[PDB]
Amino acid sequence: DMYIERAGDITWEKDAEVTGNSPRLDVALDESGDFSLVE
Amino acid sequence: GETTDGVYRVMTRRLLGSTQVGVGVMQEGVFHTMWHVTKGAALRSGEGRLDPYWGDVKQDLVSYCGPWKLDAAWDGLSEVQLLAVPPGERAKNIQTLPGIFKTKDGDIGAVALDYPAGTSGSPILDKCGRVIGLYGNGVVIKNGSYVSAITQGKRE
Numbered sequence: 001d002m003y004i005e006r007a008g009d010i011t012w013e014k015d016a017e018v019t020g021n022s023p024r025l026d027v028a029l030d031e032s033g034d035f036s037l038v039e
Numbered sequence: 040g041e042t043t044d045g046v047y048r049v050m051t052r053r054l055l056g057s058t059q060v061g062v063g064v065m066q067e068g069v070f071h072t073m074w075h076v077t078k079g080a081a082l083r084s085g086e087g088r089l090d091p092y093w094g095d096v097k098q099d100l101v102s103y104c105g106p107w108k109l110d111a112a113w114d115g116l117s118e119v120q121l122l123a124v125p126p127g128e129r130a131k132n133i134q135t136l137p138g139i140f141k142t143k144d145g146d147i148g149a150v151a152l153d154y155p156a157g158t159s160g161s162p163i164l165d166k167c168g169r170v171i172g173l174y175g176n177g178v179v180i181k182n183g184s185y186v187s188a189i190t191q192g193k194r195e
Protein backbone atom coordinates (compact mmCIF):
# COMPACT_ATOMS: atom_id res chain seq x y z
CA ASP A 1 0.00 0.00 0.00
CA MET A 2 1.69 3.13 -1.31
CA TYR A 3 1.42 6.57 0.28
CA ILE A 4 2.70 10.09 -0.51
CA GLU A 5 4.42 12.65 1.74
CA ARG A 6 5.16 16.29 0.84
CA ALA A 7 8.90 16.97 0.16
CA GLY A 8 8.85 20.65 -0.93
CA ASP A 9 7.84 23.44 -3.29
CA ILE A 10 8.64 23.42 -7.01
CA THR A 11 10.80 26.53 -7.46
CA TRP A 12 14.00 27.44 -9.39
CA GLU A 13 16.93 28.04 -6.94
CA LYS A 14 19.25 30.93 -7.75
CA ASP A 15 22.86 29.74 -7.27
CA ALA A 16 22.02 25.98 -7.22
CA GLU A 17 24.99 23.53 -7.67
CA VAL A 18 25.74 23.39 -11.44
CA THR A 19 26.87 19.96 -12.81
CA GLY A 20 26.39 17.15 -15.39
CA ASN A 21 27.45 16.99 -19.01
CA SER A 22 25.21 17.15 -22.20
CA PRO A 23 25.63 13.94 -24.26
CA ARG A 24 24.03 13.52 -27.68
CA LEU A 25 22.89 9.88 -27.97
CA ASP A 26 21.10 7.78 -30.58
CA VAL A 27 18.47 5.75 -28.68
CA ALA A 28 15.56 3.34 -29.30
CA LEU A 29 12.38 3.15 -27.18
CA ASP A 30 10.64 -0.26 -27.03
CA GLU A 31 6.95 -1.09 -26.36
CA SER A 32 7.76 -1.72 -22.66
CA GLY A 33 9.03 1.88 -22.22
CA ASP A 34 12.69 0.84 -21.99
CA PHE A 35 15.31 3.04 -23.68
CA SER A 36 18.39 1.39 -25.24
CA LEU A 37 21.48 2.74 -27.09
CA VAL A 38 21.58 2.40 -30.89
CA GLU A 39 25.09 1.64 -32.22
CA GLY B 40 -5.39 14.09 2.15
CA GLU B 41 -2.76 16.70 1.23
CA THR B 42 -3.66 18.40 -2.06
CA THR B 43 -1.19 21.34 -1.86
CA ASP B 44 0.91 21.78 -5.03
CA GLY B 45 4.50 20.61 -4.76
CA VAL B 46 6.89 17.69 -4.94
CA TYR B 47 6.09 14.48 -2.96
CA ARG B 48 7.88 11.24 -2.06
CA VAL B 49 6.06 7.99 -2.97
CA MET B 50 6.54 5.48 -0.14
CA THR B 51 5.66 1.84 0.60
CA ARG B 52 5.48 -0.25 3.79
CA ARG B 53 5.31 -3.61 1.87
CA LEU B 54 9.10 -4.14 2.12
CA LEU B 55 11.51 -3.69 5.11
CA GLY B 56 10.64 -0.50 7.11
CA SER B 57 9.34 2.44 5.04
CA THR B 58 10.91 2.53 1.60
CA GLN B 59 10.90 5.35 -0.96
CA VAL B 60 10.05 3.88 -4.40
CA GLY B 61 9.81 7.23 -6.21
CA VAL B 62 8.65 10.86 -6.40
CA GLY B 63 5.83 12.87 -8.03
CA VAL B 64 4.29 16.30 -8.70
CA MET B 65 0.94 17.60 -7.37
CA GLN B 66 -0.38 20.35 -9.68
CA GLU B 67 -3.97 21.60 -10.18
CA GLY B 68 -5.35 18.73 -8.01
CA VAL B 69 -3.60 16.00 -10.07
CA PHE B 70 -0.70 13.74 -8.91
CA HIS B 71 1.89 13.02 -11.63
CA THR B 72 4.60 10.30 -11.47
CA MET B 73 6.29 7.67 -13.65
CA TRP B 74 4.47 4.40 -14.36
CA HIS B 75 7.40 2.21 -13.18
CA VAL B 76 7.14 3.85 -9.67
CA THR B 77 3.52 2.78 -8.89
CA LYS B 78 2.76 0.20 -11.65
CA GLY B 79 -0.67 1.97 -11.76
CA ALA B 80 -1.61 1.09 -8.13
CA ALA B 81 -3.87 3.36 -5.98
CA LEU B 82 -2.11 5.73 -3.56
CA ARG B 83 -2.87 6.97 -0.06
CA SER B 84 -2.52 10.61 1.04
CA GLY B 85 -3.20 10.74 4.80
CA GLU B 86 -6.71 9.31 5.20
CA GLY B 87 -7.57 9.91 1.49
CA ARG B 88 -7.18 7.75 -1.61
CA LEU B 89 -5.78 8.76 -5.05
CA ASP B 90 -7.02 6.65 -7.93
CA PRO B 91 -5.22 6.41 -11.31
CA TYR B 92 -6.86 8.38 -14.08
CA TRP B 93 -4.51 8.06 -17.07
CA GLY B 94 -1.37 6.07 -17.74
CA ASP B 95 0.86 4.67 -20.47
CA VAL B 96 3.66 2.07 -20.04
CA LYS B 97 5.52 3.19 -23.19
CA GLN B 98 5.67 6.90 -22.16
CA ASP B 99 6.30 5.55 -18.59
CA LEU B 100 3.87 8.12 -17.07
CA VAL B 101 0.69 8.05 -14.89
CA SER B 102 -1.65 10.72 -13.49
CA TYR B 103 -4.04 10.42 -10.42
CA CYS B 104 -7.43 12.25 -9.73
CA GLY B 105 -7.41 13.86 -13.18
CA PRO B 106 -5.77 14.16 -16.60
CA TRP B 107 -2.03 15.00 -17.07
CA LYS B 108 -1.63 18.77 -16.43
CA LEU B 109 2.10 19.39 -17.12
CA ASP B 110 2.78 20.83 -20.60
CA ALA B 111 5.92 22.97 -20.39
CA ALA B 112 8.74 21.92 -22.71
CA TRP B 113 12.54 22.35 -22.64
CA ASP B 114 13.48 25.18 -25.09
CA GLY B 115 16.46 23.16 -26.48
CA LEU B 116 19.04 25.81 -25.46
CA SER B 117 18.88 26.70 -21.72
CA GLU B 118 20.12 25.06 -18.54
CA VAL B 119 17.36 23.44 -16.35
CA GLN B 120 17.16 22.20 -12.75
CA LEU B 121 16.48 18.68 -11.50
CA LEU B 122 14.59 19.07 -8.20
CA ALA B 123 16.02 15.83 -6.89
CA VAL B 124 14.24 14.14 -3.95
CA PRO B 125 16.57 11.24 -2.93
CA PRO B 126 15.46 8.54 -0.44
CA GLY B 127 15.91 9.73 3.20
CA GLU B 128 17.47 13.03 2.02
CA ARG B 129 16.23 16.64 1.63
CA ALA B 130 14.95 17.96 -1.76
CA LYS B 131 17.85 19.65 -3.60
CA ASN B 132 18.06 21.62 -6.89
CA ILE B 133 20.75 20.66 -9.41
CA GLN B 134 21.40 22.85 -12.46
CA THR B 135 22.51 21.25 -15.73
CA LEU B 136 22.53 21.74 -19.52
CA PRO B 137 20.52 18.85 -20.98
CA GLY B 138 21.93 16.58 -23.65
CA ILE B 139 19.72 14.95 -26.36
CA PHE B 140 18.18 11.53 -26.97
CA LYS B 141 17.91 11.22 -30.83
CA THR B 142 15.19 8.71 -31.80
CA LYS B 143 13.54 7.57 -35.07
CA ASP B 144 10.46 9.56 -33.91
CA GLY B 145 12.27 12.78 -32.96
CA ASP B 146 14.61 14.23 -30.36
CA ILE B 147 14.09 14.40 -26.57
CA GLY B 148 16.08 16.39 -23.94
CA ALA B 149 18.11 14.27 -21.51
CA VAL B 150 19.82 14.95 -18.15
CA ALA B 151 23.15 13.30 -17.25
CA LEU B 152 22.69 13.11 -13.47
CA ASP B 153 22.98 9.90 -11.36
CA TYR B 154 20.61 9.43 -8.42
CA PRO B 155 19.18 6.30 -6.63
CA ALA B 156 16.24 4.48 -8.38
CA GLY B 157 13.92 5.86 -5.66
CA THR B 158 14.43 9.42 -7.04
CA SER B 159 12.38 8.41 -10.20
CA GLY B 160 9.56 10.94 -10.78
CA SER B 161 11.62 13.96 -9.52
CA PRO B 162 10.64 17.04 -11.61
CA ILE B 163 12.90 18.86 -14.09
CA LEU B 164 12.10 22.64 -14.19
CA ASP B 165 12.74 25.63 -16.45
CA LYS B 166 13.80 29.15 -15.16
CA CYS B 167 10.11 30.06 -14.56
CA GLY B 168 9.66 27.10 -12.16
CA ARG B 169 7.50 25.16 -14.70
CA VAL B 170 7.83 21.37 -14.79
CA ILE B 171 9.19 20.40 -18.25
CA GLY B 172 9.26 16.63 -17.47
CA LEU B 173 10.06 13.90 -14.93
CA TYR B 174 13.45 12.26 -14.28
CA GLY B 175 13.94 8.51 -14.08
CA ASN B 176 13.53 6.72 -17.41
CA GLY B 177 16.79 6.54 -19.36
CA VAL B 178 19.87 4.53 -20.24
CA VAL B 179 23.35 3.46 -19.03
CA ILE B 180 26.04 4.69 -21.44
CA LYS B 181 29.58 3.37 -22.47
CA ASN B 182 31.26 4.65 -19.26
CA GLY B 183 28.61 3.15 -16.92
CA SER B 184 27.02 6.59 -16.38
CA TYR B 185 23.20 7.16 -16.12
CA VAL B 186 21.39 9.56 -18.48
CA SER B 187 17.60 10.13 -18.01
CA ALA B 188 15.17 11.37 -20.70
CA ILE B 189 13.26 14.54 -19.80
CA THR B 190 9.88 12.66 -19.93
CA GLN B 191 6.83 14.92 -20.49
CA GLY B 192 3.16 13.99 -21.06
CA LYS B 193 0.47 15.62 -23.20
CA ARG B 194 -2.08 18.04 -21.71
CA GLU B 195 -5.39 17.06 -23.50
Ligand SMILES: C=Cc1ccc[n+](C)c1
Nearest residue numbers: 154155156158159175185
Ligand atom coordinates in the same frame (compact mmCIF):
# COMPACT_ATOMS: atom_id res chain seq x y z
C1 LIG C 1 16.25 7.89 -11.06
C2 LIG C 1 16.10 6.69 -11.52
C3 LIG C 1 17.18 5.78 -11.96
C4 LIG C 1 18.50 6.02 -11.59
C5 LIG C 1 19.50 5.14 -11.96
C6 LIG C 1 19.20 4.03 -12.71
N1 LIG C 1 17.93 3.78 -13.08
C7 LIG C 1 17.63 2.58 -13.88
C8 LIG C 1 16.92 4.61 -12.74
